Amino acid sequence: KAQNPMRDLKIEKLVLNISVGESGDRLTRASKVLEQLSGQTPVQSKARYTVRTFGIRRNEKIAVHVTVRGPKAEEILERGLKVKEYQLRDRNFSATGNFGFGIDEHIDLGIKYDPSIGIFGMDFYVVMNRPGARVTRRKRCKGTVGNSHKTTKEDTVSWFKQKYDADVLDK
Amino acid sequence: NLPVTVEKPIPVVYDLGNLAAFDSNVLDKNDLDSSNARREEKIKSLTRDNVQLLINQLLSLPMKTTTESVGGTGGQSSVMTLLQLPDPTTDLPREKPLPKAKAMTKWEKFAAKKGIKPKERAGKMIYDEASGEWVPKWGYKGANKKLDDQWLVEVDDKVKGTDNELIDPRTLNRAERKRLVKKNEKQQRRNMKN
Amino acid sequence: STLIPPPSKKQKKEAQLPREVAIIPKDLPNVSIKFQALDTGDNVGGALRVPGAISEKQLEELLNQLNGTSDDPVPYTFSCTKTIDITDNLYSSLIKPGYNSTEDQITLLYTPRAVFKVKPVTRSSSAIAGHGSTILCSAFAPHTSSRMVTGAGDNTARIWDCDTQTPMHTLKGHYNWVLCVSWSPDGEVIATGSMDNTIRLWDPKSGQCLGDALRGHSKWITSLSWEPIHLVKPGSKPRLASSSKDGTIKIWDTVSRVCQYTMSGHTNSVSCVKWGGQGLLYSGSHDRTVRVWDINSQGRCINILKSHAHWVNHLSLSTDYALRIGAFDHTGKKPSTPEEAQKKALENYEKICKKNGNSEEMMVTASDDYTMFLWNPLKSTKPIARMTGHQKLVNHVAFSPDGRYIVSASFDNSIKLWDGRDGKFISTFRGHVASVYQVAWSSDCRLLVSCSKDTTLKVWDVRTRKLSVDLPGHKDEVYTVDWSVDGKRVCSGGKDKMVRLWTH
Amino acid sequence: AKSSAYSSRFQTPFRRRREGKTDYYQRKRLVTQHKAKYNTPKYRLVVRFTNKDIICQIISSTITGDVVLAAAYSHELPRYGITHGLTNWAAAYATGLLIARRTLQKLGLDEYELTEAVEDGPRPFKVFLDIGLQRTTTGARVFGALKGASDGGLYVPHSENRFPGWDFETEEIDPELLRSYIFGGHVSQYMEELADDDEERFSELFKGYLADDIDADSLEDIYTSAHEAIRADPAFKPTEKKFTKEQYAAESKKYRQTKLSKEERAARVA
Amino acid sequence: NARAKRALVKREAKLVENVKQALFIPGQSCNKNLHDIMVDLSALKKPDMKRFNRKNDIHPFEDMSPLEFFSEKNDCSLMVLMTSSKKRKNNMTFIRTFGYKIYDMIELMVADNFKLLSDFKKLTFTVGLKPMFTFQGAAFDTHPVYKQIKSLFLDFFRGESTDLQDVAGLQHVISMTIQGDFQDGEPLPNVLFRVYKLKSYKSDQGGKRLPRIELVEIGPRLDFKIGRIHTPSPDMVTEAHKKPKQLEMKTKKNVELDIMGDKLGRIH
Amino acid sequence: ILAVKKNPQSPMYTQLGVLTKGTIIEVNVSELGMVTAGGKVVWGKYAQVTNEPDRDGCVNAVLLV
RNA sequence: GGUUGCGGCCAUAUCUACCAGAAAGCACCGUUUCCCGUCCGAUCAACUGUAGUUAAGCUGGUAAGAGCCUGACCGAGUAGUGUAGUGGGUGACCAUACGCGAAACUCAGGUGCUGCAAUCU
RNA sequence: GAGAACAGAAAUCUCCAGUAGAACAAAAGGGUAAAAGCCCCCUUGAUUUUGAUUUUCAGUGUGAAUACAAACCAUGAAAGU
């Protein structure tokens, strides 16, 4: 069951997110640096609500995000872990097996700083699932996933321990 | 080679528009009772004879042929031959009553009295003199709302000495247009009430 | 759209009234009939009594039994002479109108027919692009309906695979418009005569050019005709006769790629040349004359036929379909050896040529004097008949594959159907609203297709003498239409630079 | 934390919608809607793709469940000479051609109905294309099967803006690229490109072609021979069955779990 | 909004009415037999059928307002209420409405000796084509109750009315026969409802234009006992059988329209 | 000529049938042999008058194609 | 008997949790030159059935689970609800004959049937 | 409900459950979930034009309004709408 090659946990997708709130030159530079870091054009996200405290109107631009898959996503993930000095908390993981973390200064990832670029923080989020994750996503005969094949927090912690040899910090 | 000439005591009447036949002959209750074992064969044979007569009538009906091909409107192409069904004869009640003609409105009575003929209504496009373009006279990008977007409007002298002096003439014209629209709606609801 | 007048109230009442069923009475007596062959006029069996409950199939089998050829019966169609055909049975065809009764004798003329049946084309199989200019000519392969050759105004021809309706080969040797194309009756080579006063030969399977062009004409090629296979001795390839605007008919031996004979009698442009089945060449030219040359007499002009007052635009022979098809049939079966091909082509020619005693090959000439002339050039120098009635020039003319009907397509927006023996007028196909450019028979002689200046094709049923189906789809004038040998496909081309394939 | 009220008030969809393989919104317009009220029966050419087979079926809707009139599969293509790539564009074309020729042969159009008493000649067979839950894309194998059936001789109403070779800037098609896709020129082009670029991937892919010594230039020839053979003999041959119905039933019932009686279940409870 | 207006226009009255819709309502007491018969008749009626799934406390001869509400909500002019009781076993009530008001009602009971559509296991016809009809027994022509039965079933299964009919669609016939003739002062005989598929064979006596017909039963065979009747008023009958007459050209004396479409007048 | 569709001067002149320059008229085009893409024969189309018939004694028009 | 494609009836078919499935089929699964689409070949599109796998998907078994369904000569012809012979009583109301006519309750049980085509050690 | 720097109850991203408990109109006692909701592509024609047909007007009775139909038109691979 665990010895079967079809239950292995892999990187489904990696989402790089920047939620800058105010739209303009800073949002454009965030989209530019995400394009630099991923090699792909990012996508904006429309405003969902309107709050005077946050100063955001309806249908405004707040954030940008990119999804990366494959060896490029693995390279970006290992750059993020290299910046994170290989120390992950147990609260970064969640019940569904995916995990995220925030980087406050993106210069250490491998991008030379420029005075126009400034300082940007970004959110890494890694989604974990086994092969056969398209059963819930294909057009024809859409179906659920059984519990045994489902992804659990303890199993993805075990996979991370096997892969990166990093202690899961309780506190 | 079975015969196709059904012989009946009482001649069957036909409603070819409804694809129906009616024979008013005598049926034996002992031959049609549920006790018998040949009752289904009797029913099948009676229906067989009536359907034979009906199909003979339908195939004796006049036929419509065409020379048009497929891919056009109509449905019938050159290879198809269609029976021309007559109007149905059986009287059937309608689901809803006939649409009553709406009574003449106040405008219609006035126009009849004054002999005003209805408008030709060729189109909604009018020629704007200041430009060289044809524009809609109402509706989407219509020419009835150009004063709303006019860059400069002269304030009329008659507005002086009134509390409407400081109000935008564009806003005043929008209010007057909306009042005219609501007056038309109220007149229509009055005609519906009457 | 202008509509037919709707039925009135009284007509609707009569329609609601019950109908009468046409049924054969069980007490129908016997009727005496005489079978007479339409082609030969030979009476068979004298007069014989038959019951009134006969069918067309049973009458056909009875006639075969009377002849004594029951092992291999040959289908027939029966008519009574007005001349009214037997549709289903004798009672409902003749006795029901009451013109011929059970007491009087009924003389039924029977005509042989084709065992195969061609379904009418009713829709466009495909619209295929590829030509850079207007399509000027088109033809089908004699052996198969899957290959079509089309010559256009972009100085090229195309070979189209009609199975997938996709282009297969491009023939790019000429420098000017490809005015005519022709597939060899053995199916081995395509000849293209062009506007640049040249003729080229192409291998179709490889889509290649057989060496160099056939040069020698000073004006553009007007028509290409092939030597018949049934006259070509086995082990040899048929020669190519070619007419041109310069008034000459050149004969080309293609194995040696030489020009042998140069007929020169015409004083104006030759409209068409035809290679008949008795070693003769018939040429129609704008000098208002028809010249008959003998290939067995060194190409000398045996006859000059002068009855037209204007250009003879076209000419057709009674055996034209057989000479075009060679040794093939509607089945598409290929002969084993060239000797077998020669014998089979001989039989195919003979079936049409030698009937009712002596072999004859009638000719029809359509001219610019709004008329046609029907000739029998071997027997007499005078025309057999003059066919008049068209208001404008007769552009195209064609004998039926069995040679019993003549169809003329004219510029008066009409087609006229005439009898193929005496040239007497039969009927007028109307429905085109512009000039009819050309026409084509089907293999079983039952259906006709015509292309017009009005951007439409029209398929007509010869038996009912009425329009069968009207096919639009071309965006411009249609210049050429052809029907396959097996009667499965129809190709059309014109000014819209597209090839339309049509099928049932 | 679903409650009894939720489970009682739940309104389940149809079975074919739960295990989604039937689009009822499309199907009701396919079956119950008519352009004219002349009562002409409708037929569907259903085209479906598995991971290893292509299914084409001519189906007439019936009130007690629809009935298949004629069927063809891509696993019958090795019989006609196509043993590799049974789920590509050319395989779809071959399956469409096969089902078209087989239907025409069965109906007698080319080599006692009530229409024979009114008309002299038979109508061309009209079927409407049914694609199910498949994306309509320019160059899809379902439209390849459509092209194959149309060339075979069935009348399927269609426009050509989804065939390969259709230019997007102008409403025109490229029959050269269409013929390349018909005779597998794209697969042969990939075969040559891999053979010249990376022998490693051409070792994995197209291994059977190397095993059978089938060159990258004979694909058109074998497709042409398959088309000729299909047109020559389209009649369906059922596969000769090694074992019988009862034998299959017994052998499968040996593996399927038997039923346990209510008394046995109560004994297990107590 | 535009879709709502289009739905209202489709619902509103017109000179040429659309096909009557049939709504199948199960009652308080229902059975598998009632469900099977309702499914078979809904197959015979569709695509002009709508079916309700829950149970409804409906008594047609005690309160018409739920039926009127259902008819007005679903825009259905034909209604079939399927209920059961000891007094009336397998009761099917056929309601026909005029202008969302109860025009007439018949109340029949299905006999226990019914064969379903699934029992025959025979090939059937294509979905949604109008059938042929045969009515056997002079009571359909003469007696008021059987007059109502004939008109009701013709209206129920008529479907679309057209002036052109494809011969390839002459598939099946519905036969209604009266179980033996009767006299005055006698109980009403049952009505037998049958469905047959046509098979045409060459006759060899009437030529190739007149074939021979044979029938194969598809079901469901039904024996209806005529329990209860509710008749419409004469004014409602006249209002329902009025004609629009806007469609027909007015017929003027001595004026005709000939084959070429010219208006001609006659003088005497 | 079949009808006077639109006189540009006035609808009154349209309904009187005035034929002046610029007037849209309907003309029978049966002899032009026009056929629709659907196969129907066109025998009525629109033309615009391009001359002054009161000045030159004749009506000249250009078809609107 | 399994499985697939197209269906009818639309929970006896649904939800939750374990186990089983030989063959065939189905599916996960490999690649991105081609036609095609996204931020992402994840979905869609194309190619090989070639590297593998029944881990899921799919089906079946199991559960005094939730839910659903069906027969009752079970409630019950009861409650309820309308007319009546001059039936009473100046009284607030009631059995009676004829009509129409339930649900709550109890018992017996159940957890998918089927139409067309093709195929499987 | 689980997680993800600023970012907490309310800003942005991911997973799972989610019969609609949202958003459109009506006042359902059964409206709509591979939608009738949200987003995208195409159409800007929508006051077309023909009619011996229905109704009304006219000193300009083969004109115009009006009803109905048809030919078109839009879109889609198509069924169709």
Author numbering:
A (entry chain J): 4 to 174
B (entry chain w): 8 to 201
C (entry chain x): 2 to 82, 93 to 515
D (entry chain D): 7 to 117, 129 to 287
E (entry chain v): 9 to 276
F (entry chain r): 197 to 261
Sentences copied from the publication:
Biogenesis of the large ribosomal (60S) subunit involves the assembly of three rRNAs and 46 proteins, a process requiring approximately 70 ribosome biogenesis factors (RBFs) that bind and release the pre-60S at specific steps along the assembly pathway. Spb1 methylates the A-loop nucleotide G2922 and a catalytically deficient mutant strain (spb1D52A) has a severe 60S biogenesis defect. Nog2 is an essential hub enzyme that acts as a key quality control element during the nucleoplasmic maturation of 60S, anchoring both the pre- and post-rotation states of the 5S rRNP (Nog2pre and Nog2post) via extensive rRNA and RBF interactions.
To address this question, we set out to capture the transition state of Nog2 GTPase activation by adding AlF4− to Nog2pre intermediates purified from the spb1D52A strain. Because the disordered A-loop remains in the vicinity of the active site after premature GTP hydrolysis, we hypothesized that addition of AlF4− could recapitulate a GTP hydrolysis transition state in these particles. The third water is H-bonded to the 2´OH of the G2922 ribose, assuming a position similar to that occupied by the methyl group of mG2922 in the WT SPB1 structure. The Nog2 transition state shows a remarkable structural similarity to the high-resolution crystal structure of the bacterial K-loop GTPase MnmE22, with near identical positioning of GDP, AlF4− and the catalytic water network. We believe this represents the first evidence of direct activation of a GTPase by an RNA nucleotide.
